[PDB]
């Protein structure tokens, strides 16, 4: 069954000889399993999808159920239009029936296929849910100890469940999320790195929304487990764990407080110096949404020694990380006490702030000018605006602020002149 032509597959499948159909279907599976350019469109245009879908229901020929399930899985892994052709052929209810198959390799293929269909977008995700996929999927995980399940089997179930949690506009149905969450929490405590990664991705999707969505996750008590996974050595685990933590601190201050209470701030010395750029960027973004909170939360950032790390990323990092650092500083100076803002200057924030006014990015200039104003406002309540003016001048910041009076964007130049007439005049 190696390297048949599509025409040969068609004559086999049209033969109405079940065994001839099995061999042609396996031939199609092997075509669709090759690395270089699987002929997905040729298979579709040959009209084979409804035949494959019909084969999913031949319970007394389990080999042709498996071969057609595999074939349809790989078609559904193509373009949106190729996934649509699988759905258009009636595959969703047929694959859901296959979840009850006594053959583990067959139900696994059905899990995989539905994951591909749900992974196309929110419409097919919700259609898979409407056909009732969740109950049979969760039933496959109703065992006392996940460790007794096959590793590949468990990984495929976790990945498909995460695709049912994925996408916005709209987010998944509330009652579907509530139904899935207890099983997700259990997978989040499993000891397989790939299960953990996909579990964290699912939690990161569920927390990417309004505070009500975040609350649903937070009240399951997963935040301490997320913080532990924040410290993992596997980058495929840290990345979604950090994204989930970052999403949660976009919620309320009380939701942010649970992240702090769980000990997340102690991981950020590593995260803010992490060699992977996106980790540094996402860690600094998370910090910016913590320095936007209450003064007692800003104080936790101070107590954990994280201000020097913010000075560090501002001083040298990828520019997108530096922009998140600028936001973190403006949020800090906006909501912080005078004492906290003083500490920021004592840690050396002024010079790397001034250097970033050189940047070809209009909004980071806006962000930095805001922070300078907030620091000056704290300096006036101390009568120490002259000392700050000297500092800003000594490091070349005044030269840059006055150059930005010449700036194209409107409130860049207005803000830069207000600074100079109020503090440097």
């Amino acid at each position: 069954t190696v390297n048949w032509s599509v025409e040969d597959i068609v004559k086999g499948i049209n033969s109405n000889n079940l065994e001839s159909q099995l061999q042609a279907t396996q031939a199609a599976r092997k075509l669709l399993s090759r690395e270089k350019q699987p002929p997905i469109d040729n298979i579709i245009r040959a009209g084979l999808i409804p035949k494959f879908v019909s084969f999913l229901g031949k319970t007394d020929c389990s080999p042709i159920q498996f071969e057609s399930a595999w074939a349809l899985t790989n078609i559904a892994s193509g373009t949106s239009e190729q996934t649509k052709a699988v759905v258009d052929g009636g595959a969703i209810p047929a694959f859901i029936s296959l979840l009850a198959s006594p053959h583990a390799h067959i139900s696994e293929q059905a899990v995989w296929a539905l994951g591909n269909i749900a992974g196309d977008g929110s419409a097919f995700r919700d259609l898979v849910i409407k056909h009732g996929a969740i109950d049979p999927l969760l039933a496959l995980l109703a065992v006392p100890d996940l460790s007794t399940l096959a590793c590949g089997y468990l990984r495929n179930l976790t990945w498909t469940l995460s695709n049912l949690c994925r996408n916005k506009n709209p987010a998944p149905p509330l009652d579907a999320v509530e139904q899935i969450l207890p099983t997700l929490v259990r997978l989040l405590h499993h000891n397989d790195p790939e299960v953990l990664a996909d579990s964290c991705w699912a939690i990161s999707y569920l927390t990417d929304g309004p505070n009500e969505r975040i609350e649903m996750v937070v009240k399951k008590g997963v935040v301490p487990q997320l913080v532990k996974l924040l410290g993992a050595t596997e980058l495929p685990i840290v990345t979604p764990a950090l994204r989930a933590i970052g999403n949660i601190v976009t919620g309320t201050d009380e939701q942010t407080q649970k992240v702090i209470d769980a000990g997340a701030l102690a991981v950020f010395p590593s995260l803010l110096t992490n060699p992977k750029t996106n980790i540094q960027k996402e860690a600094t973004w998370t910090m910016s949404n913590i320095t936007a909170g209450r003064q007692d939360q800003i104080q936790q950032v101070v107590n954990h020694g994280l201000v020097p790390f913010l000075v560090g990323v501002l001083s040298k990092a990828d520019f997108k990380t530096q922009k998140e650092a600028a936001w973190a500083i403006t949020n800090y100076t906006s909501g912080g006490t005078v004492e906290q803002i003083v500490y920021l200057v004592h840690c050396g924030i002024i010079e790397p702030l001034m250097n970033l006014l050189s940047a070809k990015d209009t909004k980071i200039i806006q962000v930095i000018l805001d922070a300078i104003s907030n620091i000056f406002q704290a300096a006036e309540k101390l009568g120490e605006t002259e000392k700050l003016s000297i500092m800003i001048e000594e490091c070349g910041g005044l030269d840059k602020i006055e150059a930005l009076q010449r700036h194209e964007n409107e409130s860049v130049y207005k803000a830069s002149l207000n600074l100079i007439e109020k503090y440097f005049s």
Partner: peptide, 8 residues
């Protein structure tokens, strides 16, 4: 963006 996996 879509999240799909081909079985090789």
């Amino acid at each position: 963006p879509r999240r799909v996996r081909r079985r090789v």
